C-alpha cells in the first residue's frame, strides 16, 4: 500500500474525476509507503525530451501500482502481488478481447487534450495498457523508423512516415508523431544486424533449398508473393539439428528485441468493457 | 503452525560436498549423467567455479585443494567432456540441512526463505567475491535487489571455458537486464560471433541469465569462508526469497 | 485538556518572555540531521 | 532511536548495535637484591 498526498486541496470536480478514474495502473519510481504529487504518474519524466522510446525504457524501469479508494486528497495505491487477481479500468482505445496478455505502453499523444488532471504545473500522465500484439507492432514500427531514418533522403522521410505511422488494429487508428531519431533504434537494430548476419552464416542448406523445392513442386499465391520478395544431403543430420537450433536462437533474440513484457492476463471482462480482471504480476 | 517454504530432500555422495557440508547456504547444481545408477548428481557452486574462467589462479588452486579427490576428478572430466554446460548441468536451489551420512542427505529450497525448521538462524546465499559484479546505472539503487546468475562462455582456441557470474540489480525486467548485460559483455560476444560459425559443438548462444530471487540492500555483508584454514573472501547475502525463473539466453 | 507544569529557558525582550532552546536533545542520535 | 519520516522519505530500519571492548593487560615487576653477607647476618647470631 502506497498512500499519495498532494498537499493541495482538490475540488468536487477533481474528486468526481478521480472517482471516474478509480482502479487504474499508475507507475511510481519511489517504492515507499508514502508518495506525493512529485513522484505520482509519468509527468515527472515527460518534460525531458518527450522521446517515446525514452519514456518506454524508464517505464520498463518503473514500479506499477493500482489506484484504489480515493479519500479526498489521500489516494491509495495497492502494490499488486504476483499472480493474484486484480480489477483494472482501461484507458487504451481498444475493444479488449478477453484472455489476451497485456503490456503497459507510453501514452500515445492524441490530438484532444487530456481531461484526467491538470493542476498547478502538474498533470496526471497515465500510461496506457495495450495488448501484447499491438505492443509488439508498435515496437516493430519503432525499429523500422530507425532502419529507414539511418538512411538519408530529402522529402522521403515524410513519405515513409505518413504511410507507415497510421496503423489500424481492431478498428482503431493510432499514430506516433515527431520521432527525434535517436540512436536507440541504432543499438536495438545493431544486435538485430548482428543476428541477421548470424542467420546468414549459420542458416542450413535445407532451408533456402526448401523454398525452391516447395515452389518447383507446388504453388500458391502467397508463395508467388514470397517469390516476388525472393527475386546431395548425405547424412549431416546432427549438423542440421545444430544449425537449425542456432537459427531458432537468433530468431528468439530478434523476437526478444521487439517483444514487450506482458504485465496482465485477462479473465473476466465487463459488458461496458471499462473494467476487466487479471491474474498476473511479473 | 505455518511454513510456506518449498524444499526437496536430496541424496548425493559425500565426496563432492567438501566445504559445503559445513557452511549452510550454497547454490546447488543438477548434473544428469549417462551412467544409469546415479542418474542425477549434485554439484557445488564453488565446485563448478573451479573451472570457471573468471576465477583467478590463486583462488582457483586454493579451492582445487579444497576439491581434490578421485570422484571429483572423474566428475570434472565428465563436465569437461560435455559439449556445452548449461543444460547438462543446471541450477537447482539453495543448500540447507546437510546431514553428512554415508551418502549425504541435503535439503534444498526451491521457493521461500532458507530455513530448515523452527525458523531459528535463517541462512543466506554465499557467493564467492570474485564471481559477482553489479552492472547498473547506480549501484544499490534505492531498495531490494534481484539476484541473477549468469553463465558466460569463452573460447581460448582449443575448447570452451565457461564462466560463472552473479549480478545484483534493482531491475526486475529481464529485457532491461539483458540489455545492460550486452553492454557489459560485448567484447567476448564479438569473439563468439567469430566462433559459433566454425564451431560444430551444439550450442547457440553466448550466455544465459536466470533469476535466483530477492535480496535486501541492507542485508549484504562481507566476510570469508574457511575450510582447512583456506581463507576465501565471500559476500554473504543474508535473507533471500528464492524465486527461480526461466533461463533467458543471449548471443 | 489536562494542564501540567514544567520549566523552560526564557529571555526578556522588552517585557516579552520567550522560550529559548535547542532541539539537539531530540536530534541526538537519529538518521536525520537537525533541520536548522 | 529513530525519527518518523514524512512524505517521500525512506523509513530507516531498526538499528541494533552490539560492541565488545576487550581488556589490555600489563604486568609490572620490582627487583631488589640482598647480599650473601646480608643473608648470613640476617638470620642468626653466630655467638652472642
mmCIF file of N, CA, C and O in Angstrom, chain A residues 83-169:
data_model
loop_
_atom_site.group_PDB
_atom_site.id
_atom_site.type_symbol
_atom_site.label_atom_id
_atom_site.label_comp_id
_atom_site.label_asym_id
_atom_site.label_seq_id
_atom_site.Cartn_x
_atom_site.Cartn_y
_atom_site.Cartn_z
ATOM 1 N N UNK A 83 0.672 -12.850 -9.534
ATOM 2 C CA UNK A 83 -0.296 -13.861 -9.898
ATOM 3 C C UNK A 83 -1.659 -13.728 -9.264
ATOM 4 O O UNK A 83 -2.520 -14.577 -9.516
ATOM 5 N N UNK A 84 -1.895 -12.701 -8.460
ATOM 6 C CA UNK A 84 -3.190 -12.544 -7.823
ATOM 7 C C UNK A 84 -4.156 -11.809 -8.749
ATOM 8 O O UNK A 84 -3.770 -11.242 -9.771
ATOM 9 N N UNK A 85 -5.430 -11.818 -8.368
ATOM 10 C CA UNK A 85 -6.498 -11.274 -9.194
ATOM 11 C C UNK A 85 -6.735 -9.810 -8.859
ATOM 12 O O UNK A 85 -6.826 -9.445 -7.687
ATOM 13 N N UNK A 86 -6.832 -8.976 -9.889
ATOM 14 C CA UNK A 86 -6.980 -7.540 -9.711
ATOM 15 C C UNK A 86 -7.882 -6.968 -10.788
ATOM 16 O O UNK A 86 -7.918 -7.457 -11.917
ATOM 17 N N UNK A 87 -8.599 -5.911 -10.433
ATOM 18 C CA UNK A 87 -9.535 -5.266 -11.341
ATOM 19 C C UNK A 87 -8.905 -3.996 -11.893
ATOM 20 O O UNK A 87 -8.416 -3.161 -11.130
ATOM 21 N N UNK A 88 -8.919 -3.859 -13.215
ATOM 22 C CA UNK A 88 -8.253 -2.772 -13.917
ATOM 23 C C UNK A 88 -9.277 -2.068 -14.792
ATOM 24 O O UNK A 88 -9.981 -2.721 -15.568
ATOM 25 N N UNK A 89 -9.356 -0.747 -14.677
ATOM 26 C CA UNK A 89 -10.092 0.055 -15.641
ATOM 27 C C UNK A 89 -9.150 0.422 -16.778
ATOM 28 O O UNK A 89 -7.988 0.763 -16.553
ATOM 29 N N UNK A 90 -9.654 0.332 -17.998
ATOM 30 C CA UNK A 90 -8.823 0.508 -19.172
ATOM 31 C C UNK A 90 -8.818 1.956 -19.640
ATOM 32 O O UNK A 90 -9.748 2.725 -19.386
ATOM 33 N N UNK A 91 -7.736 2.328 -20.301
ATOM 34 C CA UNK A 91 -7.612 3.639 -20.907
ATOM 35 C C UNK A 91 -7.275 3.592 -22.380
ATOM 36 O O UNK A 91 -7.566 4.567 -23.081
ATOM 37 N N UNK A 92 -6.660 2.518 -22.871
ATOM 38 C CA UNK A 92 -6.358 2.382 -24.273
ATOM 39 C C UNK A 92 -7.626 2.262 -25.086
ATOM 40 O O UNK A 92 -8.567 1.557 -24.709
ATOM 41 N N UNK A 93 -7.692 2.974 -26.198
ATOM 42 C CA UNK A 93 -8.906 2.927 -27.020
ATOM 43 C C UNK A 93 -9.000 1.611 -27.769
ATOM 44 O O UNK A 93 -8.555 1.512 -28.911
ATOM 45 N N UNK A 94 -9.513 0.571 -27.117
ATOM 46 C CA UNK A 94 -9.488 -0.760 -27.714
ATOM 47 C C UNK A 94 -10.764 -1.515 -27.365
ATOM 48 O O UNK A 94 -11.546 -1.044 -26.531
ATOM 49 N N UNK A 95 -11.059 -2.640 -28.021
ATOM 50 C CA UNK A 95 -12.206 -3.449 -27.596
ATOM 51 C C UNK A 95 -11.903 -4.587 -26.635
ATOM 52 O O UNK A 95 -12.870 -5.189 -26.150
ATOM 53 N N UNK A 96 -10.632 -4.919 -26.381
ATOM 54 C CA UNK A 96 -10.191 -5.717 -25.223
ATOM 55 C C UNK A 96 -10.820 -7.113 -25.165
ATOM 56 O O UNK A 96 -11.594 -7.429 -24.260
ATOM 57 N N UNK A 97 -10.490 -7.942 -26.150
ATOM 58 C CA UNK A 97 -10.940 -9.330 -26.126
ATOM 59 C C UNK A 97 -10.263 -10.077 -24.985
ATOM 60 O O UNK A 97 -9.068 -9.910 -24.750
ATOM 61 N N UNK A 98 -11.037 -10.884 -24.263
ATOM 62 C CA UNK A 98 -10.538 -11.492 -23.038
ATOM 63 C C UNK A 98 -9.499 -12.569 -23.334
ATOM 64 O O UNK A 98 -9.414 -13.110 -24.439
ATOM 65 N N UNK A 99 -8.685 -12.861 -22.322
ATOM 66 C CA UNK A 99 -7.682 -13.895 -22.408
ATOM 67 C C UNK A 99 -6.369 -13.493 -23.032
ATOM 68 O O UNK A 99 -5.412 -14.273 -22.969
ATOM 69 N N UNK A 100 -6.281 -12.315 -23.638
ATOM 70 C CA UNK A 100 -5.007 -11.896 -24.190
ATOM 71 C C UNK A 100 -4.091 -11.370 -23.092
ATOM 72 O O UNK A 100 -4.531 -10.951 -22.018
ATOM 73 N N UNK A 101 -2.799 -11.410 -23.371
ATOM 74 C CA UNK A 101 -1.826 -10.819 -22.475
ATOM 75 C C UNK A 101 -1.714 -9.328 -22.754
ATOM 76 O O UNK A 101 -1.912 -8.871 -23.882
ATOM 77 N N UNK A 102 -1.396 -8.571 -21.711
ATOM 78 C CA UNK A 102 -1.389 -7.117 -21.768
ATOM 79 C C UNK A 102 -0.026 -6.582 -21.368
ATOM 80 O O UNK A 102 0.589 -7.080 -20.426
ATOM 81 N N UNK A 103 0.427 -5.549 -22.061
ATOM 82 C CA UNK A 103 1.604 -4.798 -21.661
ATOM 83 C C UNK A 103 1.202 -3.369 -21.343
ATOM 84 O O UNK A 103 0.055 -2.952 -21.542
ATOM 85 N N UNK A 104 2.190 -2.595 -20.916
ATOM 86 C CA UNK A 104 1.981 -1.234 -20.453
ATOM 87 C C UNK A 104 2.847 -0.321 -21.306
ATOM 88 O O UNK A 104 4.060 -0.523 -21.407
ATOM 89 N N UNK A 105 2.222 0.676 -21.921
ATOM 90 C CA UNK A 105 2.807 1.377 -23.056
ATOM 91 C C UNK A 105 2.798 2.863 -22.712
ATOM 92 O O UNK A 105 1.975 3.294 -21.888
ATOM 93 N N UNK A 106 3.732 3.658 -23.236
ATOM 94 C CA UNK A 106 3.661 5.098 -23.034
ATOM 95 C C UNK A 106 2.432 5.679 -23.698
ATOM 96 O O UNK A 106 1.912 5.117 -24.680
ATOM 97 N N UNK A 107 1.924 6.805 -23.194
ATOM 98 C CA UNK A 107 0.693 7.386 -23.754
ATOM 99 C C UNK A 107 0.930 7.976 -25.138
ATOM 100 O O UNK A 107 1.721 8.905 -25.307
ATOM 101 N N UNK A 108 0.251 7.412 -26.128
ATOM 102 C CA UNK A 108 0.265 7.982 -27.465
ATOM 103 C C UNK A 108 -0.532 9.275 -27.453
ATOM 104 O O UNK A 108 -1.722 9.273 -27.123
ATOM 105 N N UNK A 109 0.131 10.373 -27.794
ATOM 106 C CA UNK A 109 -0.445 11.707 -27.659
ATOM 107 C C UNK A 109 -1.543 11.892 -28.694
ATOM 108 O O UNK A 109 -1.275 12.109 -29.875
ATOM 109 N N UNK A 110 -2.792 11.795 -28.248
ATOM 110 C CA UNK A 110 -3.916 12.124 -29.105
ATOM 111 C C UNK A 110 -4.008 13.638 -29.288
ATOM 112 O O UNK A 110 -3.408 14.417 -28.542
ATOM 113 N N UNK A 111 -4.768 14.051 -30.307
ATOM 114 C CA UNK A 111 -4.904 15.477 -30.585
ATOM 115 C C UNK A 111 -5.743 16.180 -29.527
ATOM 116 O O UNK A 111 -5.497 17.353 -29.221
ATOM 117 N N UNK A 112 -6.730 15.490 -28.964
ATOM 118 C CA UNK A 112 -7.518 16.063 -27.884
ATOM 119 C C UNK A 112 -6.704 16.089 -26.598
ATOM 120 O O UNK A 112 -5.974 15.143 -26.286
ATOM 121 N N UNK A 113 -6.827 17.184 -25.856
ATOM 122 C CA UNK A 113 -6.154 17.292 -24.572
ATOM 123 C C UNK A 113 -6.809 16.372 -23.551
ATOM 124 O O UNK A 113 -8.002 16.065 -23.629
ATOM 125 N N UNK A 114 -6.002 15.916 -22.596
ATOM 126 C CA UNK A 114 -6.490 15.034 -21.550
ATOM 127 C C UNK A 114 -7.412 15.778 -20.593
ATOM 128 O O UNK A 114 -7.255 16.975 -20.344
ATOM 129 N N UNK A 115 -8.386 15.052 -20.058
ATOM 130 C CA UNK A 115 -9.271 15.569 -19.027
ATOM 131 C C UNK A 115 -9.001 14.929 -17.677
ATOM 132 O O UNK A 115 -9.838 15.034 -16.773
ATOM 133 N N UNK A 116 -7.864 14.251 -17.526
ATOM 134 C CA UNK A 116 -7.626 13.497 -16.303
ATOM 135 C C UNK A 116 -7.317 14.444 -15.153
ATOM 136 O O UNK A 116 -8.074 14.523 -14.179
ATOM 137 N N UNK A 117 -6.232 15.204 -15.275
ATOM 138 C CA UNK A 117 -5.857 16.175 -14.259
ATOM 139 C C UNK A 117 -4.874 17.164 -14.873
ATOM 140 O O UNK A 117 -3.982 16.777 -15.628
ATOM 141 N N UNK A 118 -5.049 18.434 -14.527
ATOM 142 C CA UNK A 118 -4.061 19.475 -14.802
ATOM 143 C C UNK A 118 -4.189 20.464 -13.657
ATOM 144 O O UNK A 118 -5.168 21.210 -13.596
ATOM 145 N N UNK A 119 -3.223 20.456 -12.744
ATOM 146 C CA UNK A 119 -3.344 21.237 -11.516
ATOM 147 C C UNK A 119 -1.966 21.710 -11.081
ATOM 148 O O UNK A 119 -1.157 20.905 -10.610
ATOM 149 N N UNK A 120 -1.716 23.011 -11.221
ATOM 150 C CA UNK A 120 -0.513 23.638 -10.707
ATOM 151 C C UNK A 120 0.777 23.173 -11.348
ATOM 152 O O UNK A 120 1.661 22.666 -10.647
ATOM 153 N N UNK A 121 0.882 23.340 -12.674
ATOM 154 C CA UNK A 121 2.028 22.910 -13.489
ATOM 155 C C UNK A 121 2.320 21.420 -13.326
ATOM 156 O O UNK A 121 3.468 20.984 -13.423
ATOM 157 N N UNK A 122 1.278 20.632 -13.075
ATOM 158 C CA UNK A 122 1.425 19.199 -12.868
ATOM 159 C C UNK A 122 0.204 18.495 -13.430
ATOM 160 O O UNK A 122 -0.921 18.759 -12.995
ATOM 161 N N UNK A 123 0.423 17.597 -14.373
ATOM 162 C CA UNK A 123 -0.640 16.782 -14.929
ATOM 163 C C UNK A 123 -0.510 15.360 -14.408
ATOM 164 O O UNK A 123 0.484 14.991 -13.777
ATOM 165 N N UNK A 124 -1.540 14.565 -14.659
ATOM 166 C CA UNK A 124 -1.531 13.149 -14.319
ATOM 167 C C UNK A 124 -1.395 12.402 -15.638
ATOM 168 O O UNK A 124 -2.384 12.048 -16.280
ATOM 169 N N UNK A 125 -0.156 12.192 -16.052
ATOM 170 C CA UNK A 125 0.128 11.434 -17.257
ATOM 171 C C UNK A 125 0.032 9.958 -16.917
ATOM 172 O O UNK A 125 0.889 9.423 -16.209
ATOM 173 N N UNK A 126 -1.015 9.303 -17.392
ATOM 174 C CA UNK A 126 -1.234 7.885 -17.135
ATOM 175 C C UNK A 126 -0.808 7.108 -18.373
ATOM 176 O O UNK A 126 -1.328 7.381 -19.466
ATOM 177 N N UNK A 127 0.112 6.159 -18.258
ATOM 178 C CA UNK A 127 0.464 5.326 -19.406
ATOM 179 C C UNK A 127 -0.654 4.357 -19.739
ATOM 180 O O UNK A 127 -1.419 3.931 -18.871
ATOM 181 N N UNK A 128 -0.745 4.006 -21.014
ATOM 182 C CA UNK A 128 -1.863 3.201 -21.466
ATOM 183 C C UNK A 128 -1.570 1.724 -21.238
ATOM 184 O O UNK A 128 -0.433 1.322 -20.992
ATOM 185 N N UNK A 129 -2.618 0.910 -21.315
ATOM 186 C CA UNK A 129 -2.497 -0.542 -21.286
ATOM 187 C C UNK A 129 -2.944 -1.049 -22.644
ATOM 188 O O UNK A 129 -3.969 -0.602 -23.166
ATOM 189 N N UNK A 130 -2.157 -1.936 -23.241
ATOM 190 C CA UNK A 130 -2.461 -2.422 -24.586
ATOM 191 C C UNK A 130 -2.279 -3.927 -24.625
ATOM 192 O O UNK A 130 -1.638 -4.512 -23.743
ATOM 193 N N UNK A 131 -2.862 -4.588 -25.617
ATOM 194 C CA UNK A 131 -2.495 -5.980 -25.873
ATOM 195 C C UNK A 131 -1.074 -6.103 -26.398
ATOM 196 O O UNK A 131 -0.507 -5.185 -27.006
ATOM 197 N N UNK A 132 -0.508 -7.286 -26.152
ATOM 198 C CA UNK A 132 0.880 -7.570 -26.497
ATOM 199 C C UNK A 132 1.094 -7.570 -28.006
ATOM 200 O O UNK A 132 2.177 -7.203 -28.475
ATOM 201 N N UNK A 133 0.061 -7.926 -28.776
ATOM 202 C CA UNK A 133 0.175 -7.940 -30.233
ATOM 203 C C UNK A 133 0.414 -6.540 -30.788
ATOM 204 O O UNK A 133 1.370 -6.315 -31.541
ATOM 205 N N UNK A 134 -0.414 -5.570 -30.390
ATOM 206 C CA UNK A 134 -0.205 -4.214 -30.879
ATOM 207 C C UNK A 134 1.007 -3.564 -30.214
ATOM 208 O O UNK A 134 1.642 -2.689 -30.814
ATOM 209 N N UNK A 135 1.390 -4.014 -29.016
ATOM 210 C CA UNK A 135 2.626 -3.529 -28.410
ATOM 211 C C UNK A 135 3.846 -3.922 -29.236
ATOM 212 O O UNK A 135 4.704 -3.084 -29.553
ATOM 213 N N UNK A 136 3.922 -5.201 -29.612
ATOM 214 C CA UNK A 136 4.994 -5.663 -30.480
ATOM 215 C C UNK A 136 4.917 -5.009 -31.849
ATOM 216 O O UNK A 136 5.953 -4.753 -32.460
ATOM 217 N N UNK A 137 3.703 -4.686 -32.308
ATOM 218 C CA UNK A 137 3.517 -3.964 -33.567
ATOM 219 C C UNK A 137 4.154 -2.576 -33.516
ATOM 220 O O UNK A 137 4.904 -2.191 -34.423
ATOM 221 N N UNK A 138 3.888 -1.830 -32.438
ATOM 222 C CA UNK A 138 4.500 -0.518 -32.227
ATOM 223 C C UNK A 138 6.018 -0.629 -32.133
ATOM 224 O O UNK A 138 6.746 0.212 -32.678
ATOM 225 N N UNK A 139 6.521 -1.686 -31.481
ATOM 226 C CA UNK A 139 7.970 -1.841 -31.346
ATOM 227 C C UNK A 139 8.624 -2.170 -32.690
ATOM 228 O O UNK A 139 9.744 -1.709 -32.975
ATOM 229 N N UNK A 140 7.929 -2.956 -33.522
ATOM 230 C CA UNK A 140 8.332 -3.156 -34.914
ATOM 231 C C UNK A 140 8.423 -1.822 -35.638
ATOM 232 O O UNK A 140 9.403 -1.550 -36.341
ATOM 233 N N UNK A 141 7.423 -0.958 -35.445
ATOM 234 C CA UNK A 141 7.414 0.334 -36.130
ATOM 235 C C UNK A 141 8.541 1.244 -35.653
ATOM 236 O O UNK A 141 9.116 1.987 -36.451
ATOM 237 N N UNK A 142 8.857 1.202 -34.359
ATOM 238 C CA UNK A 142 9.995 1.953 -33.823
ATOM 239 C C UNK A 142 11.303 1.525 -34.481
ATOM 240 O O UNK A 142 12.045 2.360 -35.029
ATOM 241 N N UNK A 143 11.573 0.210 -34.461
ATOM 242 C CA UNK A 143 12.776 -0.352 -35.075
ATOM 243 C C UNK A 143 12.840 -0.047 -36.571
ATOM 244 O O UNK A 143 13.914 0.237 -37.122
ATOM 245 N N UNK A 144 11.682 -0.059 -37.227
ATOM 246 C CA UNK A 144 11.608 0.187 -38.660
ATOM 247 C C UNK A 144 11.855 1.655 -38.998
ATOM 248 O O UNK A 144 12.499 1.960 -40.008
ATOM 249 N N UNK A 145 11.337 2.576 -38.177
ATOM 250 C CA UNK A 145 11.604 4.006 -38.363
ATOM 251 C C UNK A 145 13.089 4.297 -38.219
ATOM 252 O O UNK A 145 13.654 5.092 -38.977
ATOM 253 N N UNK A 146 13.758 3.621 -37.287
ATOM 254 C CA UNK A 146 15.202 3.789 -37.191
ATOM 255 C C UNK A 146 15.970 3.199 -38.359
ATOM 256 O O UNK A 146 16.955 3.783 -38.824
ATOM 257 N N UNK A 147 15.537 2.032 -38.839
ATOM 258 C CA UNK A 147 16.143 1.436 -40.027
ATOM 259 C C UNK A 147 15.986 2.321 -41.257
ATOM 260 O O UNK A 147 16.886 2.386 -42.103
ATOM 261 N N UNK A 148 14.866 3.027 -41.369
ATOM 262 C CA UNK A 148 14.698 3.908 -42.517
ATOM 263 C C UNK A 148 15.415 5.242 -42.315
ATOM 264 O O UNK A 148 16.005 5.784 -43.252
ATOM 265 N N UNK A 149 15.425 5.775 -41.096
ATOM 266 C CA UNK A 149 15.972 7.099 -40.835
ATOM 267 C C UNK A 149 17.477 7.097 -40.585
ATOM 268 O O UNK A 149 18.070 8.175 -40.459
ATOM 269 N N UNK A 150 18.108 5.925 -40.485
ATOM 270 C CA UNK A 150 19.555 5.852 -40.665
ATOM 271 C C UNK A 150 19.917 6.167 -42.116
ATOM 272 O O UNK A 150 20.871 6.909 -42.391
ATOM 273 N N UNK A 151 19.144 5.628 -43.062
ATOM 274 C CA UNK A 151 19.226 6.058 -44.455
ATOM 275 C C UNK A 151 18.734 7.494 -44.589
ATOM 276 O O UNK A 151 17.786 7.904 -43.916
ATOM 277 N N UNK A 152 19.366 8.261 -45.474
ATOM 278 C CA UNK A 152 19.081 9.687 -45.590
ATOM 279 C C UNK A 152 18.592 10.032 -46.986
ATOM 280 O O UNK A 152 19.299 9.800 -47.972
ATOM 281 N N UNK A 153 17.392 10.599 -47.062
ATOM 282 C CA UNK A 153 16.876 11.185 -48.289
ATOM 283 C C UNK A 153 16.205 12.506 -47.948
ATOM 284 O O UNK A 153 15.999 12.844 -46.778
ATOM 285 N N UNK A 154 15.873 13.266 -48.983
ATOM 286 C CA UNK A 154 15.151 14.520 -48.830
ATOM 287 C C UNK A 154 13.739 14.324 -49.363
ATOM 288 O O UNK A 154 13.563 13.777 -50.458
ATOM 289 N N UNK A 155 12.748 14.729 -48.558
ATOM 290 C CA UNK A 155 11.310 14.590 -48.845
ATOM 291 C C UNK A 155 10.887 13.133 -49.038
ATOM 292 O O UNK A 155 9.879 12.849 -49.689
ATOM 293 N N UNK A 156 11.647 12.200 -48.469
ATOM 294 C CA UNK A 156 11.249 10.804 -48.411
ATOM 295 C C UNK A 156 11.048 10.301 -46.997
ATOM 296 O O UNK A 156 10.364 9.291 -46.818
ATOM 297 N N UNK A 157 11.631 10.972 -45.997
ATOM 298 C CA UNK A 157 11.357 10.647 -44.602
ATOM 299 C C UNK A 157 9.877 10.822 -44.284
ATOM 300 O O UNK A 157 9.251 9.937 -43.688
ATOM 301 N N UNK A 158 9.293 11.939 -44.730
ATOM 302 C CA UNK A 158 7.859 12.156 -44.562
ATOM 303 C C UNK A 158 7.048 11.144 -45.363
ATOM 304 O O UNK A 158 5.999 10.683 -44.904
ATOM 305 N N UNK A 159 7.546 10.762 -46.545
ATOM 306 C CA UNK A 159 6.858 9.798 -47.399
ATOM 307 C C UNK A 159 6.819 8.411 -46.768
ATOM 308 O O UNK A 159 5.828 7.687 -46.912
ATOM 309 N N UNK A 160 7.869 8.033 -46.044
ATOM 310 C CA UNK A 160 7.828 6.774 -45.310
ATOM 311 C C UNK A 160 6.910 6.892 -44.099
ATOM 312 O O UNK A 160 6.064 6.020 -43.858
ATOM 313 N N UNK A 161 7.053 7.984 -43.338
ATOM 314 C CA UNK A 161 6.417 8.081 -42.024
ATOM 315 C C UNK A 161 4.899 8.216 -42.142
ATOM 316 O O UNK A 161 4.160 7.580 -41.383
ATOM 317 N N UNK A 162 4.403 9.002 -43.109
ATOM 318 C CA UNK A 162 2.954 9.199 -43.182
ATOM 319 C C UNK A 162 2.228 7.948 -43.669
ATOM 320 O O UNK A 162 1.071 7.719 -43.298
ATOM 321 N N UNK A 163 2.893 7.129 -44.481
ATOM 322 C CA UNK A 163 2.315 5.855 -44.886
ATOM 323 C C UNK A 163 2.389 4.831 -43.761
ATOM 324 O O UNK A 163 1.431 4.085 -43.529
ATOM 325 N N UNK A 164 3.522 4.782 -43.056
ATOM 326 C CA UNK A 164 3.760 3.735 -42.071
ATOM 327 C C UNK A 164 3.039 3.978 -40.752
ATOM 328 O O UNK A 164 2.602 3.017 -40.109
ATOM 329 N N UNK A 165 2.906 5.235 -40.337
ATOM 330 C CA UNK A 165 2.660 5.545 -38.932
ATOM 331 C C UNK A 165 1.221 5.267 -38.521
ATOM 332 O O UNK A 165 0.976 4.676 -37.464
ATOM 333 N N UNK A 166 0.261 5.694 -39.331
ATOM 334 C CA UNK A 166 -1.142 5.459 -39.015
ATOM 335 C C UNK A 166 -1.464 3.987 -39.236
ATOM 336 O O UNK A 166 -1.537 3.523 -40.378
ATOM 337 N N UNK A 167 -1.643 3.249 -38.146
ATOM 338 C CA UNK A 167 -1.927 1.826 -38.218
ATOM 339 C C UNK A 167 -3.319 1.586 -37.659
ATOM 340 O O UNK A 167 -3.892 2.423 -36.957
ATOM 341 N N UNK A 168 -3.866 0.417 -37.984
ATOM 342 C CA UNK A 168 -5.205 0.035 -37.557
ATOM 343 C C UNK A 168 -5.160 -1.362 -36.970
ATOM 344 O O UNK A 168 -4.704 -2.301 -37.628
ATOM 345 N N UNK A 169 -5.633 -1.496 -35.736
ATOM 346 C CA UNK A 169 -5.774 -2.793 -35.087
ATOM 347 C C UNK A 169 -7.082 -2.792 -34.321
ATOM 348 O O UNK A 169 -7.257 -1.975 -33.411
#
